[PDB]
Write an enzyme that holds these catalytic residues in place. Structure first.
Site, short mmCIF file in Angstrom:
data_model
loop_
_atom_site.label_atom_id
_atom_site.label_comp_id
_atom_site.label_asym_id
_atom_site.label_seq_id
_atom_site.Cartn_x
_atom_site.Cartn_y
_atom_site.Cartn_z
CG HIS A 19 31.23 70.27 50.79
ND1 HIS A 19 30.88 69.65 51.96
CD2 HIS A 19 30.45 71.37 50.71
CE1 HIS A 19 29.93 70.34 52.56
NE2 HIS A 19 29.65 71.41 51.80
CG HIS A 75 29.02 75.69 49.14
ND1 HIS A 75 27.91 75.04 48.66
CD2 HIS A 75 29.33 75.10 50.31
CE1 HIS A 75 27.55 74.10 49.53
NE2 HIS A 75 28.41 74.10 50.52
CG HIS A 130 30.48 74.24 54.35
ND1 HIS A 130 29.30 74.28 53.60
CD2 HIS A 130 30.68 75.48 54.84
CE1 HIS A 130 28.83 75.51 53.65
NE2 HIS A 130 29.62 76.24 54.41
CD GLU A 183 26.17 77.08 50.85
OE1 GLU A 183 26.38 76.39 51.87
OE2 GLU A 183 25.41 76.75 49.91
CB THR A 186 23.66 75.05 52.92
OG1 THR A 186 24.74 74.40 52.28
CG2 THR A 186 24.06 75.70 54.27
CG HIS A 238 24.68 68.48 44.02
ND1 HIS A 238 23.66 68.95 43.21
CD2 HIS A 238 24.36 67.19 44.31
CE1 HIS A 238 22.78 67.99 43.02
NE2 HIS A 238 23.18 66.91 43.66
N1 LIG Z 1 26.54 72.24 52.66
S1 LIG Z 1 26.38 71.27 53.94
O1 LIG Z 1 25.29 71.72 54.76
O2 LIG Z 1 27.67 71.04 54.61
C1 LIG Z 1 25.96 69.78 53.02
C2 LIG Z 1 25.99 68.55 53.84
C3 LIG Z 1 26.41 67.51 52.80
C4 LIG Z 1 25.98 66.25 53.45
B1 LIG Z 1 26.62 64.77 52.87
B2 LIG Z 1 25.32 63.56 53.11
C5 LIG Z 1 24.04 64.48 53.85
B3 LIG Z 1 24.38 66.14 54.01
B4 LIG Z 1 24.44 65.09 55.43
B5 LIG Z 1 25.02 63.51 54.88
B6 LIG Z 1 26.69 63.69 54.28
B7 LIG Z 1 26.14 64.63 55.72
B8 LIG Z 1 27.12 65.42 54.45
B9 LIG Z 1 25.73 66.27 55.16
ZN LIG Z 2 28.39 72.95 52.26
#
Ligand SMILES: [N]S(=O)(=O)[C][C][C]C123[B@@]45[B@@]67[C@@]89[B@]1%10B81%11B698B746B814B562B%10%1143
Ligand SMILES: [Zn+2]
EC number: 4.2.1.1
Length: 257
Positions: A91, A93, A116, A103, A195, A61
């Site tokens: 990461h 987008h 982010h 976003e 997101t 993703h």
């Molecule tokens: N795009 S965003 O909202 O930063 C996506 C979050 C990606 C994650 B990866 B796994 C799930 B969601 B939570 B845990 B770790 B922690 B991190 B957050």
């Molecule tokens: Zn993100």
């Protein structure tokens, strides 16, 4: 399995994750005239000098750089936050062309990309427990525009050819995330969500006003990544952004006048 395409993208996510239609979903449009300056908001404290990066990974993703979060080495405090939040990963987008990819939007403007930096609240002990709490996570969001190169991003760009497809990872030690930050830490903040699935309503969003500039060559390398695994039909990893969601009953606050 969810994604960003016509048959599995953001408009479909509510079927597996009904919170997608919830009261505090992200991202949102930031209407700069409506956001209220809050003189009670503190400066954000970003303490990344002892950060320990571990790995870089294509997760199907996005791509992410993961950090050692087993001690208070790279932490976010202050700003709108109560307590201490450990950096877990960053990461991005991004779009298929420079006019989309972010976003969050600012007065409906879309940036070419959005960074982010994901942090979790140490009072909950681990990230899995933190995502079940309304103050569990703090995500620092940084807009990218295309112009001059960002030198601190180049080490990331140069290894993307080694993680082209979903599931691939590499060693990525000694990376300093301070090199991704703009000059100003002026910000907007509001209560929101992840997101991506599971879309949990656990995030205090902190979105910096000042974008970083990256070069066309840097963003082109993002766009050579693949959503697919090796051996499957090639589908460029582009347009991996969720659109703005309804603000509903929330106030966006500004740290600056
Ligand atoms: N795009 S965003 O909202 O930063 C996506 C979050 C990606 C994650 B990866 B796994 C799930 B969601 B939570 B845990 B770790 B922690 B991190 B957050
Ligand atoms: Zn993100």
């Amino acid at each position: 399995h969810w994604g960003y395409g016509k048959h599995n993208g953001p408009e479909h996510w509510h079927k597996d994750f009904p919170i997608a239609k919830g009261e505090r979903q992200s991202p949102v449009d930031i209407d700069t005239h409506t956001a209220k300056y809050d003189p009670s908001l503190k400066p954000l404290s970003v303490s990344y000098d002892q950060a320990t990066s571990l790995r870089i990974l294509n997760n199907g993703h996005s791509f992410q750089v993961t950090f050692d979060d087993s001690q208070d080495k790279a932490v976010l405090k202050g700003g709108p936050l109560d307590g201490t939040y450990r950096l877990l990963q960053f990461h991005f987008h991004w779009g298929s062309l420079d006019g989309q990819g972010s976003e969050h939007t600012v007065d409906k403007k879309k940036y070419a990309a959005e960074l982010h930096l994901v942090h979790w609240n140490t009072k909950y002990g681990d990230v899995g427990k933190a995502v079940q709490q309304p103050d569990g996570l703090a995500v620092l969001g940084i807009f990218l525009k295309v112009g001059s190169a960002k030198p601190g991003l180049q080490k990331v760009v140069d290894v993307l050819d080694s993680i082209k497809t979903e599931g691939k990872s590499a060693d990525f030690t000694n990376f300093d995330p301070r090199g991704l930050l703009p000059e100003s830490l002026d910000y907007w903040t509001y209560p929101g969500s992840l997101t991506t699935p599971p879309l949990a309503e656990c995030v205090t969003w902190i979105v910096l006003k000042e974008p970083i500039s990256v070069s066309s060559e840097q963003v082109l390398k993002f766009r050579k990544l693949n959503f697919n695994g090796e051996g499957e039909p090639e589908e460029l990893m582009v347009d991996n952004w969720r659109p703005a969601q309804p603000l509903k009953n929330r106030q966006i606050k500004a740290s600056f006048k």
